[PDB]
């Protein structure tokens, strides 16, 4: 019973999170059967602090799918966006 939520983060100057998972990754601490990308840490006073939470699964960023991608590709993409990052996340209600 999850839902897809759209969250806008304004880099200031970063997003303010750490992520894990991906194809060929070593899993994640939330859903071990899922090779997707998960938020593992959010800076407490950072740009994502009232918007994202550990456990969120990132499935899209500025229109780019995060399904079936490797962690390195997700990291490079998120770092390359300069300002607005519009995420679709899957979150437990």
């Amino acid at each position: 019973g999850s839902m897809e939520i759209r969250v806008r983060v304004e880099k200031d100057p970063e997003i303010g999170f750490r992520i894990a998972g991906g194809v060929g990754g070593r899993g994640n601490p939330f859903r071990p059967d899922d090779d997707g990308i998960f938020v593992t840490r959010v800076s407490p006073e950072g740009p994502a602090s009232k918007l994202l939470q550990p456990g969120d699964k990132i499935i899209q960023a500025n229109g780019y799918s995060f399904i079936n991608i490797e962690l390195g590709q997700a990291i490079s993409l998120l770092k390359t966006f300069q300002n607005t990052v519009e995420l679709i996340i899957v979150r437990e209600v």
Binding site: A20, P29, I75
Partner: peptide
């Protein structure tokens, strides 16, 4: 598991 650095 492997965590990215901060971004």
């Amino acid at each position: 598991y492997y965590e990215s650095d901060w971004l």
